[PDB]
Amino acid sequence: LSTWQTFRRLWPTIAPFKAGLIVAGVALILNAASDTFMLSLLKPLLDDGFGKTDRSVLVWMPLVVIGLMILRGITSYVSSYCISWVSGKVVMTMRRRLFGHMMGMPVSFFDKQSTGTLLSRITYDSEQVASSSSGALITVVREGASIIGLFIMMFYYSWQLSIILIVLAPIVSIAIRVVSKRFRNISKNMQNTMGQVTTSAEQMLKGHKEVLIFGGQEVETKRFDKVSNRMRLQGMKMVSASSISDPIIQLIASLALAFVLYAASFPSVMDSLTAGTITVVFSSMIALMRPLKSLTNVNAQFQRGMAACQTLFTILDSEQEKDEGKRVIERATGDVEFRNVTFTYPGRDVPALRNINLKIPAGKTVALVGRSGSGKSTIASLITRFYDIDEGEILMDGHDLREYTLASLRNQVALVSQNVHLFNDTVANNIAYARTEQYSREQIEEAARMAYAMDFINKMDNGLDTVIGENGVLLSGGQRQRIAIARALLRDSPILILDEATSALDTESERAIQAALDELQKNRTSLVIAHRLSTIEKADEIVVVEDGVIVERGTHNDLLEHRGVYAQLHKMQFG
Amino acid sequence: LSTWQTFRRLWPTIAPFKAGLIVAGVALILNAASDTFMLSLLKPLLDDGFGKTDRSVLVWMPLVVIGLMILRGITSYVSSYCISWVSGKVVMTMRRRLFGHMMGMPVSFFDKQSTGTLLSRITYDSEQVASSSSGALITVVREGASIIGLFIMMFYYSWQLSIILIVLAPIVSIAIRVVSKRFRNISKNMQNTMGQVTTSAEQMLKGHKEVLIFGGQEVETKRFDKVSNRMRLQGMKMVSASSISDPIIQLIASLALAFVLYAASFPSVMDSLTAGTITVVFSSMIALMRPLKSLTNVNAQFQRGMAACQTLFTILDSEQEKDEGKRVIERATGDVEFRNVTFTYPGRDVPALRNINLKIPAGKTVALVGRSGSGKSTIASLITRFYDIDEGEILMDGHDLREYTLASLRNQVALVSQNVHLFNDTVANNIAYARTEQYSREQIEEAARMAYAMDFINKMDNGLDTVIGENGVLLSGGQRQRIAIARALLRDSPILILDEATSALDTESERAIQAALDELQKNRTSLVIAHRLSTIEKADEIVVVEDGVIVERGTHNDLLEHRGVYAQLHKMQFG
């Protein structure tokens, strides 16, 4: 079906590791051959061994069995380890490609699908594809070699008896299937009437409140006596019908065995039939029962594996960042204009952002206080060329963002918030996530001192080289904000956007936070998601954001004099 | 444990059917003996059969095999059928006892447990007890006989080899267990670090929004390269640790087999060891593996069965109707008085009925219109000695119900409603649920014509002997009410209580319903759950019922003049 197409597309990944696959295949063939030779040992043991008084075969058999199982163990370990090497390298390469494609893909993908299922796709599914493919490979190779060995042995010892058994087995299978089907039909046919007797017994108990008033408690007893006799007789009849089935299957199996014995009684075949050839052939026939089932299930398992591969290939080779710009900023002035911008979250409705006329000049500050969601958070996300507007205009330095590459545009905008991301590395490297080669330690320590992050780094183990714990084990919210301030200060980003909604005012030592904030907000463009009073009054411009469109544009004194929604928000301390 | 006492208490039920159990046991023993004899047949076939040129064993073997397995089939059928007879009769008796106890049990039990689970207890659990007990008996008897036969064969052919195998098996088992335990410990020990590697990979993808702004997309690629190296190496080490295990188990098993062969090589045992004795002993040892597992699981199966039996016995030997009366009603006058009655539904709180002062004289009519639930339905249920009052007094004919038996008290009260239970029997027997032997057909047909049910009985198949379909297939709501009216009319019950809440006024032919009603309400005591206007104005007394206590007591004109809750209910047509 479509499995072979996906496998053909996937094969170039597995191509360079042909040596491991060849070693695994040779090992699996040797393993199956060793097992079939172990079965073949049954002839000398039972023919020239136990039977005679010669203590030759019986005294060498233990050593041969030990050697064969040493070979089987070594071979099994080799095959498992080499198939594991191939599977591990393929999984590593595919996870690496999937992740390298994952970063550099629109945030829309990362909000549509939760973060957890992304890790699931990277680990579990990319493990399942190779696990199922390798299982299919080892099953096919090993069981095919085992079946070939068993058939070669069977036809090598006594071909007449082998032919008899081979032509006889399908008839037995067909008869068993027919008998089972017929008696299953009988069972369901009687389940049909179980339904009605059960519903009658149910109806019997549904009128207890009408039995008591009328005094008819004996009549109900007689009726249940009759219905219980009905139930018992019918259950008896099912048991008889079901117990008629299995003896028939057993009888046809015994008849097949008796026919094989009778055929062997004839002189045509018995000439090549000793006491050990029978034991070898009739045991090979038994041992050739599990490989057949494994070969039957291998196709379904491989199809499942290739379906998982197709899902992963759907995640791969998909949309990416809509990079369409040409020019690169050296240093932006900072003036940004939102005009006639109407933007909607992809995959949703009820537009939240529409018809703005906002201007932020260089060196000034604009607040974006909103009720709960408003459009301030959307504006902060959008200004860094996250989810793009459906229609509108965004003018930075007199040019739009669409014409401008989204590789240097993000470099000139800084994000400051309490919910900043800290990753497991040294603090001297967490500062300046990138550009760790052209930013010397002198600037790093100067920025750390300016951001007042030197106060707690000194009182910590290893100093500037402390490795951050998993998911912020060491650093706290205020410390995280200070490290983000350090990042924004070290990189001379002309435009910054800062958030205060997730910030908690209960923590002490906020004087250093305010000092770092005012140090960062020095002669550079700044957008403030304001909910703290001290960050509101000195702001040059305040633009309260309501759902859809803004409704306030003025200073704090003007808005207070207007007695609008700004005063109401100030009454509740802006939430 | 607790199984044996429950089985001892249950045994008297199974005692009279000892013959079926004996036949089943003898059959199971014969079946196991036939199987062991078939395994024993391998010696003549392989020793002086195939091996030699004697044309004796190989020609009789088909006939002997066919005869043995015909015996096995016939015997299996006999054992199954007789154990089914015993199980079916035990189940019938136990269901009969359980149902006979269920009727005559306080309604409180029937409302505490849903109607469905009672049918489940009667059918499924009472089947499970006998099914598990019979399965335990069959497993114990058959597998014990099979094990005894196989051990007798093994020690009869070659006692030295049998002793070697018996003393060799436990140490092999112990070694397998310890190896498996050690490698499972290794696997979990490394899963421990899989957890932290996975959480690091999770942390990698949780900061995509902070990778883009800072431009550090290559650094994340390098970090994931290193963590993917970690993942692949550690998964490799998992696979190596897991794959080291199974070859060890195979090697110890083969070492045990090699030791058996080497021991057989000695002249102490090899003297009594031919080419067929080996094939019989080493195949009996294989056949002695599944009976052991069945014998191990039989105890758990029997314990589950006896736990189900204990649950059923908990349903049995439980509370019943609190019969405490002495005398018997001949014909009550009809006057009833509820004085200072405060009653609560058992198992709940918020008492529904408290401090009632109601008097209903003989031949009078009293309405009990309530908003939705009120206490009208509770009073109607309680008047027939359903759930009993916590404290209060109910005076009928000047005596209380507690002193008066709840076997003739229910006989004189009639219940009329649209939700009247009809059962699958002839309509001539649906009327007069009981007393079908002292009530001649003349009275039945006169009551049918008086209740105006004769109109639709004539226009239906079989006339008066029509068998009602399952759950009211034939009769309708109006016909159900008419048949209930016929029941209440044929039995000259001095006191009747009628409901109208469940009745629907959309159905036509209500003139016959009204005629049946006013014919029924003729010179006898009647309590009316009034929601229909035509049964309200003609009522001599109306008592509006509110939550807890009644609030109104007067005729329709007086209640309308009072302009109380009765007028408001009349505005909405009493719901």
JSON list of C-alpha atoms in Angstrom, two decimals, chain A residues 46 50 55 58-59 61-62 65-66 69-70 73 77 80 84-85 88-89 92 95-96 99 103-105 110 115-116 119 122 198 201-214 216-217 220 223-225 228-229 231-232 236 239-240 243-244 247 250-251 254-255 258 261-262 264-265 270 273-275 278-279 386 410-411 413 415 420-421 423-424 433-434 471 487 491, chain B residues 46 50 55 58 61-62 65-66 69-70 73 77 80 84-85 88-89 92 95-96 99 103-105 107 110 115-116 118-119 122 198 201-214 216-217 220 223-225 228-229 231-232 236 239-240 243-244 247 250-251 254-255 258 261-262 264-265 270 273-275 278-279 386 410-411 413 415 421 423-424 433-434 471 487 491:
[
{"chain": "A", "resi": 46, "resn": "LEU", "atom": "CA", "xyz": [17.18, -41.21, 19.41]},
{"chain": "A", "resi": 50, "resn": "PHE", "atom": "CA", "xyz": [19.92, -44.02, 23.56]},
{"chain": "A", "resi": 55, "resn": "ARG", "atom": "CA", "xyz": [28.13, -44.38, 24.75]},
{"chain": "A", "resi": 58, "resn": "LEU", "atom": "CA", "xyz": [25.11, -39.74, 24.17]},
{"chain": "A", "resi": 59, "resn": "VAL", "atom": "CA", "xyz": [28.49, -38.62, 25.58]},
{"chain": "A", "resi": 61, "resn": "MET", "atom": "CA", "xyz": [25.61, -34.58, 22.72]},
{"chain": "A", "resi": 62, "resn": "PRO", "atom": "CA", "xyz": [25.94, -32.46, 25.93]},
{"chain": "A", "resi": 65, "resn": "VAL", "atom": "CA", "xyz": [24.22, -28.67, 22.83]},
{"chain": "A", "resi": 66, "resn": "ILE", "atom": "CA", "xyz": [26.36, -26.40, 25.02]},
{"chain": "A", "resi": 69, "resn": "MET", "atom": "CA", "xyz": [23.55, -22.54, 22.74]},
{"chain": "A", "resi": 70, "resn": "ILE", "atom": "CA", "xyz": [26.76, -20.56, 23.27]},
{"chain": "A", "resi": 73, "resn": "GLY", "atom": "CA", "xyz": [23.53, -16.56, 22.80]},
{"chain": "A", "resi": 77, "resn": "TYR", "atom": "CA", "xyz": [23.49, -10.51, 21.51]},
{"chain": "A", "resi": 80, "resn": "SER", "atom": "CA", "xyz": [20.31, -7.24, 19.03]},
{"chain": "A", "resi": 84, "resn": "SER", "atom": "CA", "xyz": [19.99, -1.37, 18.17]},
{"chain": "A", "resi": 85, "resn": "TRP", "atom": "CA", "xyz": [22.89, 0.66, 16.76]},
{"chain": "A", "resi": 88, "resn": "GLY", "atom": "CA", "xyz": [19.43, 4.38, 17.52]},
{"chain": "A", "resi": 89, "resn": "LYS", "atom": "CA", "xyz": [21.32, 6.25, 14.82]},
{"chain": "A", "resi": 92, "resn": "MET", "atom": "CA", "xyz": [18.86, 10.28, 16.47]},
{"chain": "A", "resi": 95, "resn": "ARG", "atom": "CA", "xyz": [14.76, 13.55, 15.90]},
{"chain": "A", "resi": 96, "resn": "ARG", "atom": "CA", "xyz": [17.54, 15.99, 15.01]},
{"chain": "A", "resi": 99, "resn": "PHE", "atom": "CA", "xyz": [13.66, 19.50, 15.95]},
{"chain": "A", "resi": 103, "resn": "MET", "atom": "CA", "xyz": [12.46, 25.76, 15.70]},
{"chain": "A", "resi": 104, "resn": "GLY", "atom": "CA", "xyz": [12.01, 28.32, 12.89]},
{"chain": "A", "resi": 105, "resn": "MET", "atom": "CA", "xyz": [8.32, 27.36, 12.41]},
{"chain": "A", "resi": 110, "resn": "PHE", "atom": "CA", "xyz": [3.10, 25.99, 18.79]},
{"chain": "A", "resi": 115, "resn": "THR", "atom": "CA", "xyz": [3.93, 21.81, 24.06]},
{"chain": "A", "resi": 116, "resn": "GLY", "atom": "CA", "xyz": [3.62, 18.32, 25.54]},
{"chain": "A", "resi": 119, "resn": "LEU", "atom": "CA", "xyz": [7.77, 16.32, 22.87]},
{"chain": "A", "resi": 122, "resn": "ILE", "atom": "CA", "xyz": [9.82, 13.98, 18.99]},
{"chain": "A", "resi": 198, "resn": "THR", "atom": "CA", "xyz": [-33.76, -11.86, 30.74]},
{"chain": "A", "resi": 201, "resn": "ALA", "atom": "CA", "xyz": [-37.24, -11.73, 34.50]},
{"chain": "A", "resi": 202, "resn": "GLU", "atom": "CA", "xyz": [-36.54, -7.99, 34.59]},
{"chain": "A", "resi": 203, "resn": "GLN", "atom": "CA", "xyz": [-40.23, -7.21, 34.12]},
{"chain": "A", "resi": 204, "resn": "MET", "atom": "CA", "xyz": [-41.00, -9.59, 37.00]},
{"chain": "A", "resi": 205, "resn": "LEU", "atom": "CA", "xyz": [-39.24, -7.35, 39.56]},
{"chain": "A", "resi": 206, "resn": "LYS", "atom": "CA", "xyz": [-40.49, -4.02, 38.16]},
{"chain": "A", "resi": 207, "resn": "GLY", "atom": "CA", "xyz": [-43.88, -4.32, 39.87]},
{"chain": "A", "resi": 208, "resn": "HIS", "atom": "CA", "xyz": [-43.01, -5.11, 43.48]},
{"chain": "A", "resi": 209, "resn": "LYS", "atom": "CA", "xyz": [-45.10, -2.17, 44.68]},
{"chain": "A", "resi": 210, "resn": "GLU", "atom": "CA", "xyz": [-48.17, -3.66, 42.95]},
{"chain": "A", "resi": 211, "resn": "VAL", "atom": "CA", "xyz": [-47.56, -7.19, 44.24]},
{"chain": "A", "resi": 212, "resn": "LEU", "atom": "CA", "xyz": [-47.85, -6.14, 47.91]},
{"chain": "A", "resi": 213, "resn": "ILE", "atom": "CA", "xyz": [-51.11, -4.17, 47.70]},
{"chain": "A", "resi": 214, "resn": "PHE", "atom": "CA", "xyz": [-53.06, -6.86, 45.84]},
{"chain": "A", "resi": 216, "resn": "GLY", "atom": "CA", "xyz": [-50.56, -11.69, 45.00]},
{"chain": "A", "resi": 217, "resn": "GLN", "atom": "CA", "xyz": [-47.20, -12.81, 46.35]},
{"chain": "A", "resi": 220, "resn": "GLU", "atom": "CA", "xyz": [-45.42, -14.11, 41.46]},
{"chain": "A", "resi": 223, "resn": "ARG", "atom": "CA", "xyz": [-44.45, -17.26, 37.68]},
{"chain": "A", "resi": 224, "resn": "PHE", "atom": "CA", "xyz": [-40.81, -17.00, 38.69]},
{"chain": "A", "resi": 225, "resn": "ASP", "atom": "CA", "xyz": [-40.68, -20.77, 39.18]},
{"chain": "A", "resi": 228, "resn": "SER", "atom": "CA", "xyz": [-36.51, -19.99, 36.20]},
{"chain": "A", "resi": 229, "resn": "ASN", "atom": "CA", "xyz": [-37.15, -23.44, 34.76]},
{"chain": "A", "resi": 231, "resn": "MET", "atom": "CA", "xyz": [-33.81, -20.09, 32.07]},
{"chain": "A", "resi": 232, "resn": "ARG", "atom": "CA", "xyz": [-32.19, -23.26, 33.39]},
{"chain": "A", "resi": 236, "resn": "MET", "atom": "CA", "xyz": [-28.47, -26.28, 29.62]},
{"chain": "A", "resi": 239, "resn": "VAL", "atom": "CA", "xyz": [-23.93, -25.72, 27.38]},
{"chain": "A", "resi": 240, "resn": "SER", "atom": "CA", "xyz": [-24.74, -28.84, 25.37]},
{"chain": "A", "resi": 243, "resn": "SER", "atom": "CA", "xyz": [-19.66, -28.73, 24.52]},
{"chain": "A", "resi": 244, "resn": "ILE", "atom": "CA", "xyz": [-20.54, -30.51, 21.26]},
{"chain": "A", "resi": 247, "resn": "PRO", "atom": "CA", "xyz": [-14.72, -32.71, 20.76]},
{"chain": "A", "resi": 250, "resn": "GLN", "atom": "CA", "xyz": [-10.20, -32.76, 18.66]},
{"chain": "A", "resi": 251, "resn": "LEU", "atom": "CA", "xyz": [-11.66, -35.72, 16.75]},
{"chain": "A", "resi": 254, "resn": "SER", "atom": "CA", "xyz": [-6.94, -37.23, 15.87]},
{"chain": "A", "resi": 255, "resn": "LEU", "atom": "CA", "xyz": [-8.28, -38.53, 12.56]},
{"chain": "A", "resi": 258, "resn": "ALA", "atom": "CA", "xyz": [-4.32, -41.55, 12.47]},
{"chain": "A", "resi": 261, "resn": "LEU", "atom": "CA", "xyz": [0.22, -43.09, 10.83]},
{"chain": "A", "resi": 262, "resn": "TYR", "atom": "CA", "xyz": [-1.71, -45.33, 8.42]},
{"chain": "A", "resi": 264, "resn": "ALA", "atom": "CA", "xyz": [3.39, -44.28, 7.14]},
{"chain": "A", "resi": 265, "resn": "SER", "atom": "CA", "xyz": [2.38, -47.93, 7.62]},
{"chain": "A", "resi": 270, "resn": "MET", "atom": "CA", "xyz": [8.31, -46.40, 5.69]},
{"chain": "A", "resi": 273, "resn": "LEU", "atom": "CA", "xyz": [11.41, -43.94, 8.30]},
{"chain": "A", "resi": 274, "resn": "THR", "atom": "CA", "xyz": [13.45, -44.88, 11.39]},
{"chain": "A", "resi": 275, "resn": "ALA", "atom": "CA", "xyz": [12.75, -44.10, 15.06]},
{"chain": "A", "resi": 278, "resn": "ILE", "atom": "CA", "xyz": [9.76, -39.58, 12.87]},
{"chain": "A", "resi": 279, "resn": "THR", "atom": "CA", "xyz": [10.83, -37.61, 15.95]},
{"chain": "A", "resi": 386, "resn": "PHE", "atom": "CA", "xyz": [4.73, 36.97, 15.53]},
{"chain": "A", "resi": 410, "resn": "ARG", "atom": "CA", "xyz": [13.71, 40.50, 16.09]},
{"chain": "A", "resi": 411, "resn": "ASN", "atom": "CA", "xyz": [17.29, 41.45, 17.01]},
{"chain": "A", "resi": 413, "resn": "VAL", "atom": "CA", "xyz": [13.35, 44.41, 19.82]},
{"chain": "A", "resi": 415, "resn": "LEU", "atom": "CA", "xyz": [11.26, 41.53, 25.64]},
{"chain": "A", "resi": 420, "resn": "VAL", "atom": "CA", "xyz": [11.10, 35.11, 30.82]},
{"chain": "A", "resi": 421, "resn": "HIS", "atom": "CA", "xyz": [12.68, 31.81, 29.81]},
{"chain": "A", "resi": 423, "resn": "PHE", "atom": "CA", "xyz": [17.61, 27.64, 30.21]},
{"chain": "A", "resi": 424, "resn": "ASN", "atom": "CA", "xyz": [20.08, 25.23, 31.78]},
{"chain": "A", "resi": 433, "resn": "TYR", "atom": "CA", "xyz": [21.63, 33.84, 24.58]},
{"chain": "A", "resi": 434, "resn": "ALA", "atom": "CA", "xyz": [23.42, 34.23, 21.25]},
{"chain": "A", "resi": 471, "resn": "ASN", "atom": "CA", "xyz": [12.98, 24.75, 35.19]},
{"chain": "A", "resi": 487, "resn": "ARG", "atom": "CA", "xyz": [19.93, 40.57, 28.67]},
{"chain": "A", "resi": 491, "resn": "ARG", "atom": "CA", "xyz": [22.26, 44.04, 23.86]},
{"chain": "B", "resi": 46, "resn": "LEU", "atom": "CA", "xyz": [9.02, -45.44, 18.52]},
{"chain": "B", "resi": 50, "resn": "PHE", "atom": "CA", "xyz": [8.84, -47.46, 13.33]},
{"chain": "B", "resi": 55, "resn": "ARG", "atom": "CA", "xyz": [4.24, -54.58, 10.87]},
{"chain": "B", "resi": 58, "resn": "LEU", "atom": "CA", "xyz": [2.24, -49.15, 13.25]},
{"chain": "B", "resi": 61, "resn": "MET", "atom": "CA", "xyz": [-1.82, -47.54, 16.27]},
{"chain": "B", "resi": 62, "resn": "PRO", "atom": "CA", "xyz": [-4.35, -45.65, 14.07]},
{"chain": "B", "resi": 65, "resn": "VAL", "atom": "CA", "xyz": [-5.62, -43.59, 18.64]},
{"chain": "B", "resi": 66, "resn": "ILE", "atom": "CA", "xyz": [-9.09, -43.26, 17.08]},
{"chain": "B", "resi": 69, "resn": "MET", "atom": "CA", "xyz": [-9.93, -40.08, 21.29]},
{"chain": "B", "resi": 70, "resn": "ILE", "atom": "CA", "xyz": [-13.50, -41.22, 20.65]},
{"chain": "B", "resi": 73, "resn": "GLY", "atom": "CA", "xyz": [-14.75, -36.98, 23.18]},
{"chain": "B", "resi": 77, "resn": "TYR", "atom": "CA", "xyz": [-19.33, -34.47, 26.57]},
{"chain": "B", "resi": 80, "resn": "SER", "atom": "CA", "xyz": [-19.66, -31.30, 30.66]},
{"chain": "B", "resi": 84, "resn": "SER", "atom": "CA", "xyz": [-24.00, -28.51, 33.64]},
{"chain": "B", "resi": 85, "resn": "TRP", "atom": "CA", "xyz": [-27.01, -30.32, 35.10]},
{"chain": "B", "resi": 88, "resn": "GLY", "atom": "CA", "xyz": [-28.10, -25.48, 36.40]},
{"chain": "B", "resi": 89, "resn": "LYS", "atom": "CA", "xyz": [-30.13, -27.03, 39.19]},
{"chain": "B", "resi": 92, "resn": "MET", "atom": "CA", "xyz": [-32.22, -22.47, 39.61]},
{"chain": "B", "resi": 95, "resn": "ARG", "atom": "CA", "xyz": [-32.28, -17.85, 42.15]},
{"chain": "B", "resi": 96, "resn": "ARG", "atom": "CA", "xyz": [-35.65, -19.17, 43.29]},
{"chain": "B", "resi": 99, "resn": "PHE", "atom": "CA", "xyz": [-36.34, -13.99, 44.40]},
{"chain": "B", "resi": 103, "resn": "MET", "atom": "CA", "xyz": [-40.56, -10.15, 47.28]},
{"chain": "B", "resi": 104, "resn": "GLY", "atom": "CA", "xyz": [-41.79, -9.47, 50.82]},
{"chain": "B", "resi": 105, "resn": "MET", "atom": "CA", "xyz": [-38.78, -7.17, 51.49]},
{"chain": "B", "resi": 107, "resn": "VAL", "atom": "CA", "xyz": [-39.63, -1.02, 49.57]},
{"chain": "B", "resi": 110, "resn": "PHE", "atom": "CA", "xyz": [-35.96, -1.48, 46.37]},
{"chain": "B", "resi": 115, "resn": "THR", "atom": "CA", "xyz": [-34.21, -2.19, 39.73]},
{"chain": "B", "resi": 116, "resn": "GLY", "atom": "CA", "xyz": [-31.48, -3.17, 37.26]},
{"chain": "B", "resi": 118, "resn": "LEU", "atom": "CA", "xyz": [-31.40, -6.60, 41.42]},
{"chain": "B", "resi": 119, "resn": "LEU", "atom": "CA", "xyz": [-31.79, -8.43, 38.11]},
{"chain": "B", "resi": 122, "resn": "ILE", "atom": "CA", "xyz": [-30.35, -12.64, 40.41]},
{"chain": "B", "resi": 198, "resn": "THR", "atom": "CA", "xyz": [13.03, 13.57, 28.84]},
{"chain": "B", "resi": 201, "resn": "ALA", "atom": "CA", "xyz": [14.21, 17.73, 26.17]},
{"chain": "B", "resi": 202, "resn": "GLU", "atom": "CA", "xyz": [10.84, 19.10, 27.31]},
{"chain": "B", "resi": 203, "resn": "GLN", "atom": "CA", "xyz": [12.54, 22.22, 28.66]},
{"chain": "B", "resi": 204, "resn": "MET", "atom": "CA", "xyz": [14.26, 22.63, 25.29]},
{"chain": "B", "resi": 205, "resn": "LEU", "atom": "CA", "xyz": [10.97, 23.24, 23.43]},
{"chain": "B", "resi": 206, "resn": "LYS", "atom": "CA", "xyz": [9.35, 25.40, 26.13]},
{"chain": "B", "resi": 207, "resn": "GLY", "atom": "CA", "xyz": [11.23, 28.54, 25.11]},
{"chain": "B", "resi": 208, "resn": "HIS", "atom": "CA", "xyz": [10.64, 28.78, 21.37]},
{"chain": "B", "resi": 209, "resn": "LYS", "atom": "CA", "xyz": [9.27, 32.31, 21.77]},
{"chain": "B", "resi": 210, "resn": "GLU", "atom": "CA", "xyz": [12.55, 33.38, 23.41]},
{"chain": "B", "resi": 211, "resn": "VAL", "atom": "CA", "xyz": [14.76, 31.65, 20.84]},
{"chain": "B", "resi": 212, "resn": "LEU", "atom": "CA", "xyz": [13.39, 33.72, 17.93]},
{"chain": "B", "resi": 213, "resn": "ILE", "atom": "CA", "xyz": [13.75, 37.18, 19.48]},
{"chain": "B", "resi": 214, "resn": "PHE", "atom": "CA", "xyz": [17.37, 36.73, 20.57]},
{"chain": "B", "resi": 216, "resn": "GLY", "atom": "CA", "xyz": [19.93, 32.09, 19.04]},
{"chain": "B", "resi": 217, "resn": "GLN", "atom": "CA", "xyz": [18.57, 29.36, 16.79]},
{"chain": "B", "resi": 220, "resn": "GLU", "atom": "CA", "xyz": [19.54, 25.52, 20.42]},
{"chain": "B", "resi": 223, "resn": "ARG", "atom": "CA", "xyz": [22.19, 21.83, 22.52]},
{"chain": "B", "resi": 224, "resn": "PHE", "atom": "CA", "xyz": [19.68, 19.43, 20.99]},
{"chain": "B", "resi": 225, "resn": "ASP", "atom": "CA", "xyz": [22.51, 17.68, 19.15]},
{"chain": "B", "resi": 228, "resn": "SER", "atom": "CA", "xyz": [20.14, 13.62, 21.26]},
{"chain": "B", "resi": 229, "resn": "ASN", "atom": "CA", "xyz": [23.57, 12.03, 21.59]},
{"chain": "B", "resi": 231, "resn": "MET", "atom": "CA", "xyz": [19.32, 9.98, 24.34]},
{"chain": "B", "resi": 232, "resn": "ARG", "atom": "CA", "xyz": [20.74, 7.57, 21.77]},
{"chain": "B", "resi": 236, "resn": "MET", "atom": "CA", "xyz": [21.59, 1.86, 23.52]},
{"chain": "B", "resi": 239, "resn": "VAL", "atom": "CA", "xyz": [18.89, -2.28, 24.92]},
{"chain": "B", "resi": 240, "resn": "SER", "atom": "CA", "xyz": [22.24, -3.86, 25.83]},
{"chain": "B", "resi": 243, "resn": "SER", "atom": "CA", "xyz": [19.34, -8.13, 25.69]},
{"chain": "B", "resi": 244, "resn": "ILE", "atom": "CA", "xyz": [22.00, -9.54, 28.03]},
{"chain": "B", "resi": 247, "resn": "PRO", "atom": "CA", "xyz": [20.53, -15.50, 26.43]},
{"chain": "B", "resi": 250, "resn": "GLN", "atom": "CA", "xyz": [18.40, -19.93, 27.50]},
{"chain": "B", "resi": 251, "resn": "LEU", "atom": "CA", "xyz": [21.94, -20.89, 28.50]},
{"chain": "B", "resi": 254, "resn": "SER", "atom": "CA", "xyz": [20.30, -25.73, 27.96]},
{"chain": "B", "resi": 255, "resn": "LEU", "atom": "CA", "xyz": [22.88, -26.39, 30.68]},
{"chain": "B", "resi": 258, "resn": "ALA", "atom": "CA", "xyz": [23.00, -31.04, 28.93]},
{"chain": "B", "resi": 261, "resn": "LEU", "atom": "CA", "xyz": [21.99, -35.98, 28.98]},
{"chain": "B", "resi": 262, "resn": "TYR", "atom": "CA", "xyz": [25.37, -36.39, 30.70]},
{"chain": "B", "resi": 264, "resn": "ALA", "atom": "CA", "xyz": [21.87, -40.40, 31.37]},
{"chain": "B", "resi": 265, "resn": "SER", "atom": "CA", "xyz": [25.23, -41.21, 29.76]},
{"chain": "B", "resi": 270, "resn": "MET", "atom": "CA", "xyz": [21.30, -45.83, 30.76]},
{"chain": "B", "resi": 273, "resn": "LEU", "atom": "CA", "xyz": [16.70, -46.22, 28.82]},
{"chain": "B", "resi": 274, "resn": "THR", "atom": "CA", "xyz": [15.62, -47.12, 25.27]},
{"chain": "B", "resi": 275, "resn": "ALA", "atom": "CA", "xyz": [14.65, -44.85, 22.35]},
{"chain": "B", "resi": 278, "resn": "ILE", "atom": "CA", "xyz": [13.17, -41.07, 26.48]},
{"chain": "B", "resi": 279, "resn": "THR", "atom": "CA", "xyz": [10.41, -39.87, 24.15]},
{"chain": "B", "resi": 386, "resn": "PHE", "atom": "CA", "xyz": [-44.95, 1.49, 52.92]},
{"chain": "B", "resi": 410, "resn": "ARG", "atom": "CA", "xyz": [-53.05, -3.72, 51.96]},
{"chain": "B", "resi": 411, "resn": "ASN", "atom": "CA", "xyz": [-56.04, -5.76, 50.75]},
{"chain": "B", "resi": 413, "resn": "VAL", "atom": "CA", "xyz": [-56.65, -0.13, 50.01]},
{"chain": "B", "resi": 415, "resn": "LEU", "atom": "CA", "xyz": [-54.30, 2.25, 44.09]},
{"chain": "B", "resi": 421, "resn": "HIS", "atom": "CA", "xyz": [-47.98, -2.12, 36.44]},
{"chain": "B", "resi": 423, "resn": "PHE", "atom": "CA", "xyz": [-47.80, -8.12, 33.71]},
{"chain": "B", "resi": 424, "resn": "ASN", "atom": "CA", "xyz": [-47.65, -10.64, 30.90]},
{"chain": "B", "resi": 433, "resn": "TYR", "atom": "CA", "xyz": [-53.98, -10.18, 40.35]},
{"chain": "B", "resi": 434, "resn": "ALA", "atom": "CA", "xyz": [-54.69, -12.66, 43.14]},
{"chain": "B", "resi": 471, "resn": "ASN", "atom": "CA", "xyz": [-43.82, -4.05, 28.94]},
{"chain": "B", "resi": 487, "resn": "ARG", "atom": "CA", "xyz": [-59.14, -4.03, 39.38]},
{"chain": "B", "resi": 491, "resn": "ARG", "atom": "CA", "xyz": [-62.29, -5.96, 44.50]}
]
